[model samples]
Target chain A: NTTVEKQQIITSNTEQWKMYSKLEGKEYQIHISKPKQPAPDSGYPVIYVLDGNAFFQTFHEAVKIQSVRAEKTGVSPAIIVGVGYPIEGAFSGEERCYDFTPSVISKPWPKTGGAHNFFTFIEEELKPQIEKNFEIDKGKQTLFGHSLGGLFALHILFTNLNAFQNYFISSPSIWWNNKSVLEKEENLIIELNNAKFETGVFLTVGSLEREHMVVGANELSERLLQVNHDKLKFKFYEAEGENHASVVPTSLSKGLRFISYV
Target chain B: VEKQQIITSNTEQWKMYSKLEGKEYQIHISKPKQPAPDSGYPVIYVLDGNAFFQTFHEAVKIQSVRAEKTGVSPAIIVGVGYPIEGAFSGEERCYDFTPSVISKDAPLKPDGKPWPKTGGAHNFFTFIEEELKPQIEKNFEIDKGKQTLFGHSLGGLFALHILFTNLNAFQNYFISSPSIWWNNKSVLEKEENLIIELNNAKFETGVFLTVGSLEREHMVVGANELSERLLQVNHDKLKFKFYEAEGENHASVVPTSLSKGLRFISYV
Candidate 1:
C-alpha cells in the first residue's frame, strides 16, 4: 500500500527561466549556475551546456564540488548555463534531432539539420538574457556539447567561429549526413589559418564508445591539428573505460582543467 | 535589465522530530520515477545526507534512467540529513556516529579544543530502526530484503558497528574509507564476534568496502586487515568486495565510491 504522493526532487542552487525562442518557435527551459563569489575584475568565465534537462545536475555537481577545491584541482570557479527543454528523459522528444544537426540528412534518424536557427536563438535570445543579468566575461565564454550536441558545437565552430573563445566537443556525430563534417573541416581550416583566433579547444571521446565514434573523433583531431593555427590551442583525450553516455562527466572535468590556465 | 530570480532544481524536504533523540531532522527524499507502473523499490539510507544528498541523487537518477536501457536495477534513494546549514554539523556528527569513548579524554578538534560528548551511535541506530524506518515504510513501498546502508568516514564506522551488533539490520552495506582509527582502533575488537555471527546467519547479505590510495597508511593497512579477517570467515550467506581507488583522497573519493557502491549492491 504505497500511496505516498511523490515529491519533486531538487538538486542544485540555480536560476531557471523560460524563454520563447522565435528562432526555434519553442519555449526553452534554461538553468543557470552562478558562482558564489563575486565576479573578479576580469569578470567570470561562462560555460553554456547542451542537453540541460538530462545533464544539468551532473554538470552542476562536478563544477560545484571541484571548484570548491579549485585551488588544488586547477578547476576555476565559473558560471554554468544549461540549455534544455521542459520535457523529461535523457534527451528532448524530437527538437534536439533538428536543432543539433547541420544541413545533414541521414535517414532512420529523421528530424535533422536546424543548427542555423538554434544558433540564432542562443546568440540573440539566450546570450543577451544571460549577459544582461550576470557579470560574465564575454571573451572567456565556452560552449560544451556531447554526442549530437557535439555535432552542434562543431557546426558553430565552423560557421559562427567567433561565438565562443573555448570549445568542448565530445564524440561528435561526424557520421551524420554521410560524413558531411569532413567537408566543413576543409573550409574551417582555411578560415582558421587567417582568423587569428586565440582559442582553446578540447576534444574527448570514450575508449569504449563505438568504433566509428572513436575513429571519427581521432580524424577530427588530426584534421584540426593539421590546420595547426598559431593562436588555436587544442587537446584531445580518450577517457579510459568510459562509454558514450558516461564520457561527459569525465571529459568535462578534463576540459575545465585544460582551460583553467588559458 | 530584467530582474533575476533564483530557482533550485527541485527537492522535497520535511521536518521530523525524533522521539528517541529528542531532536529535529530535515529528511530529503527522492522517490523513483514510476509514471504508470508499480514496482516496490529497494531503499538506500544515506548518511551525511545534507552534503552528499544532491550529488548522490544526481548520480542515481541519471544512472537509473540509463539503467532502463542498460539493465541495472533502479532503487529508491533516501538521504537522512540534519536541519543544519552546512553539509556537516561537527559536534552532532561526532555524537551520532561514535559507539563509545575509549579514551577518558575526548577527541581534539582542529584547533586542539575538546570535542563534544560522543558514543551515541546506539541511540542513533535506535532512532533509525524504531522511528525513521516506520515513518519511511508508512510512506513508500520498499523491498524488505534489499535494504542497504551507505556511509563514509565516521558514518562508515557506525555501519560497521551496526554490522557487528545487529547483523540483520540491513541486507547490504556500502562502507567507504571508514575511520577505523577512531578511538584508537577499538572497532577491530568487534571483528571476532562479527565473524561468528555471520557464520551462523542464514540470510544472504552483501558488503562493499572501499578506500582511496591517497589516504593515510594506517587507514589502508587497517582496511586490508579487516577485509582479510572478514574473508577468513567464509560465510556462505555473506558476500563482500573491497575496491581501492587510485589517486583519490578523502574529499574526491565520495562521488566515485557512491557511484560504484550503488551499482555493486544492485548488481544481479
Candidate 2:
C-alpha cells in the first residue's frame, strides 16, 4: 500500500509576479530577487534570464552567495529577474517552443516564431514594471540564456542590439532553421560598420556536446568577433567534462565573473 | 500610476508518511519526462533532502536531457526529508541517525540543553531497507541494482555505518563529510573485522568518500584514515575514491561535492 501528502515550500529571496500578455494571450511569471544593498549612483545591474522556471533558483543562489564575497570574487550583487511562464512543471515545453524560437523556415516545431512578441512583452511591459518597482541601471542590463533560450538571445543580439549591454549566451542553437541566422550576421556586421555601442559578450559551450554545436559555437564566436567593433568585448570559453545540460551552472558562474568586474 | 503585483506558490514538493517510522517525511521525486527505459532508471536516495533537493534535482534534469550523447543517463532523484516547518529537526535526526555509543565531546545546544536520545541508526536503516524502499519502488519503476545513498555530516556518519555493517544495502555509497570522530572514535571501532570480512565477502560495492578541507583537522584525518584502511583491505570487491573540497567548511561541503559525488557513483 501507498499514500500521498502535500505541503507548502518556503522559497526565500524571491517574489513572483504574473501578468497577462496580450502578445501571447497567456499569463507569464517573472520571478525577481534584489540585492541587499542600496542602489549605487548608477543603480544596481539587472540580469534578465530566459527559461526562468528551470534556472531561477540556480542563478539566484549563485549570484546571492558570490555577491557576499564580491570584493574577492569580483561579482557584484545585482537584481536578478527571471522571465518565465505560469506553469506547474519545470518548463512548459509548448510555451517555451512558442516563445523562444524566432521565425524558422522549417516548421518541425509548432507555435514557434514568437521571439519578437516575447521581446516586445519584456521591453514594453516587463521593463516598465521592473523600473517602477526597483532602481536598476539601464546601461548595465544583462541577458542570460541557454539552448533555445540562447537562440532567442542571438535573435535579440542581431535584431535588437541595444536591449542588453552584457550578454551571457551558452550553446546557442545556430543549427536551427538550417543556419539561417548567418544572414542576420551579415546585417549585424553592416550595422556595426558605422555604430559604436559598448557591449560585453561571453559565449560558452561544452566540449562534450554534439560536434555541430561545439563547432557552431566557435564559428559564431569568431564571426561576431570579426566585426572588431571597438565598443564590443567578446570572449568564448569551452567547459571541460560538461554537456549541454550540466553546462548551465558552470557557464553561468563563468559569465557572472566575466560581466561583473575586472 | 500602475503598481507591481506579487504572486507565490509552493506545490513543487511532494509530502508522504512512512508507516514504519511513524513520522511524516517530505519526499521530493524527479523523474525523466519520457517513459522508463528497458533497463529502468537508476535512483539516487538523498538524505537531508530539505537542504540538497533543489541543487541535485536541477542538476540531474539538465544533465540527462541528452543522455545518449552526454553519457549522463536519466535517473530518478528521491529526496527524503523530515516533515518539519523549518530546515530540519536537529534533535529528532540526532536520535535517528546515531548509533548506540555516545560521543563524550558531543557539544550542548546553544541553550545548554543536553543532547537528545541517540543510537537509533539501526532502526533508521531498517526504515530505508524495509519501509521506504518498498514504498518508493511500488510507486516508481526503478533499477534496484543501481541505487545510491548520499548524506552529509552526521548523515554522512550514518551512511558509513550502513556501508560497514550492511555492505550490500546499496551498491553505491556516497559519504560526504562524515562525523567519523563520533563516540570517541567509535565509528573506527565498528571496522574491527574489515579485512577478514572483505576477504570472505562475495558482493562488490562502490564508495565515494569526501571531506571539507576547512573542516576540523581530526575530521579530515579521520576521513583519510578510513580511506587508507579501506584501501589496505585490497579486496577486489571494493572500489573507493576520496576527495577534499577546497575552500569549503563542514557547512558548505555537501553542496560543493554533491555533483561530484553523483558522478563518482554513476557507471558508464
Candidate 3:
C-alpha cells in the first residue's frame, strides 16, 4: 500500500527529441512546447531558453498558464524551445560550463570557451530544425539565458544582434574572464546605430545575489542605455528577495510579459 | 530521432483510490537529491497538482541547490490531483475544492452548463489527512511538525477551511487568490472560531496569504480583510504575512506567488 509507481511526466502540446549538432559535435536534447491555440497571422513568437533541462518546464508552464488570459497577463501564446544537453539530472554542470561561458579565463575549468560554437549550433542547427517543424514568427524570436548562460546571451547580443529579436539576460556572469564581456560593448554600440529592426533587451538580476553580480548588471544596463538607439529597447529589473538560482523562474515570468507586450 | 516524454527528474506519480470520495486520485511527488536531515525533510502538499506540480517541483529543485543563498530549504512536494490528462481538471476540482454548493441561480460554466457537484471539501480533507498523509509518511522520511499546505483559488478556500477547522493538520498554510466569494462568503464564518482556537492552542502556526493586484477588487479586499482580522487576534504563536503581486492577474500571478510563498514557508 505504501509503494508508489513511477510515471513519466508528459506535458500537453510538448515534445522532446534529440539532435546531433555537427558544430558542437554533441547530441543535444531539445524540448519544445507548442501553443494550444491556432497561430496568429504573423505566427507565434518563439522563445529559446538555455539550461533547458532545469528551466524548460517552468517556461512551458508560464506560457501555457499566462497566455490563457493574454489581455490581463500580457503574455501571448508562443512556442517555447529549451536547448539542453542529454543528461540524467537537472543540470549537466560540466557541459553547461563549457557551452555557456564566452571565453577562456585563468580559472581551472578546462572545458570552457565553447560559447561561440554553442551559439552557432543554436543559430544554424536548432533554429532551422525548429522552423521546419513549426510556424514561428521569424521577427519575434527570443533568447533567454541565466548565469553563465547569460554571458553567452550577451555575447550573441553584441556580436549578432539579428540572431534574436529579444534577449533576456538574467544574472550574467560578467565577472567571467575579468569582465571580458564589457569589451564587446564598444562594438555593440556601433552596431546598434545601424540596426534596422527593433531589438529588446531584458536584463534582470536578483537583489540577493553577490555584490558584483548586482553591480555588474546595473553597469551593463547603464552602458546599454547610453547607446540611445531608437531601435534598441532596454529594461532592467531587480527581483527583490530572490537569489541567483531562484531568480530564473521569476525573471522568465517577467521576461515573457516584456517580450510579448513591451 | 525518437521522441520522448520530458520527465521531471527525481519525481514520481501513482494513483490511489480514495474510499471517502469514491474516486481515484493521482499523487505526484518530488524529493530533493540532498539527504534528509535527522528530523526528516519538510513536505509541501499542493492542491491542483496537475497544473502546479511541475512549477513547484522545478522551483524547489532549482532553488534548493543554493539553499544557503536562496533561503529555500530542500523539501518534498506532494501534488494531489485527478488521474486525468492536461492541467486543471475543472469539473473535478470544482467538486473537490468547494466548501458548499452555490445557489441554483449561480454562474454557469463557460459552456453554459450548470456547475458540477460541489460541497465535498470535508471528504477531500479527510482523504488527505487520513489516507494521503499516511501513505506519504510511510514512503518518505517526512518531518511531521514541518508540514505545509499550499492551495490557490477554490483550493485556497479548502486550505482556509482546514486552517480554521483542523489547525493542527499543518504547521504552515499558503492561501493564494482564494475564491472568497464562494457560497456568499461562507468561509468568513469560520474566522471567529479560528481566532478562538488560536487563543486556546499552544502550537505555533504560520499563514501566508497572497493575491494579484489585477484580480477582482473583491478578491484583493477579501484577502486584505482576512489578514487584518487574523492579525488583530494577537495570538502569540501566530505568524502571518499578506502580499499583492503587482500587475498580475488570476492566471499570471501563480508563478510569482509560488516563488515567493515557497520561500516564505520554507524560511527556517
Model 1 docking category: acceptable
Which pairs of residues collide in candidate 2?
Answer: B99-B119
Candidate 2 per-residue C-alpha lDDT over B17-94 given as tens digits, one digit per residue, 9 for 90 to 100: 555667666776767665777768788888877656666766666656655655556678777887754345687678
Off by over 4 Å in 3: A1-6, A106-108, B105-112, B199-202
Which pairs of residues collide in candidate 1? A9-B10, A9-B11, A10-B10, A10-B11
Interface RMSD of each: 4.7, 5.2, 2.0
lDDT (0 to 1) per candidate:
0.75, 0.75, 0.84
lDDT of 1 by residue, A1-262 (tens): 3222233344435777877877556778887887666787888889999987766766666666667667655677788898987665557858888889888584466666778889999998899889988888888888998888998998888877788888898888878778886667656756566664577889999887889999989888887777667768888988665666656654556677777643
How far residue B183's Cα lies from its native spot in candidate 2, in Å, is 7.9
Per-residue lDDT over B1-268 for candidate 1, one digit per residue giving the tens place of the 0 to 100 score: 2223333343466676667667666677766674312546778888888766766665666666666342336676677777765556677778888998657655566898666778989888888898778778777788777788988888899999888878888989999899988988877778778877787665788898888776789998888888887777677888988877665655555664555577677744
Residue A225 of model 1, lDDT score: 76
lDDT of 3 by residue, B116-168 (tens): 78988888888898889998898899999889999989989999988888888
